[PDB]
Amino acid sequence: ASEPSGPPTDLWVESRGPFTILVRWKAPPKEYWHGKLKGYYVGYKMEGSPQPYSFKTVEAMNVNITHEYLLNSLKKSTKYSIVVKAYNAAGTGPASQELIVKTLDGVLPRPPSVSLLSASDSTISVKWGHTISPVTGYTLHYRKKVGHWLHVPLLASDQTRYTLTGLDSDTTYNVYVTANNRYGRGDPSGILSVRTGD
């Protein structure tokens, strides 16, 4: 049993506001653990800064999943380099490659709240809400359970209601809404599932 010899895989970073960055990753292959993993360290620093990396400890014994961690308390509109390491009972393993990501210039809108209105054999009607302070528009996301996500871009000036048309009958669709801002796209709402009538 030794320290891991491989970096985490499938690293993905995305800034979710002026102060926060969402980091996703997967574990290294089983052949590079050398001892069951106890967790990870997520490293971050300002891109060119001479200061060293700051590491956040993320405990994750559960594996076979996509791990994610929300860095917070960051600086507005600045670029950071992000890495992730793995560790076990023995020492820490090697870090992943750097992903450089910039924080946003402002706060994103809150995730909307979606609710079902009605459903027919070929249509589904949906309401949503703001709980916002300035929103610039929305996007409605829908799919059939077995299919791929389709997108309906929308304007904030309209009524916050929409009716999907031309749908298959006796088919379960999933629906959710995202809000839009000058600074970017907010988190998604919860996914509404409903089946069309026969």
Author numbering: 389 to 521, 525 to 589
Paper quotes:
Thus, this kink conformation may reflect a physiological geometric assembly. The inter-domain interface of the kink contains a salt bridge formed by R404 and D578, and the hydrophobic interaction mediated by L492 and L496. The cis interactions are mediated by the FNIII domains that are constant within the sDscam subfamilies.
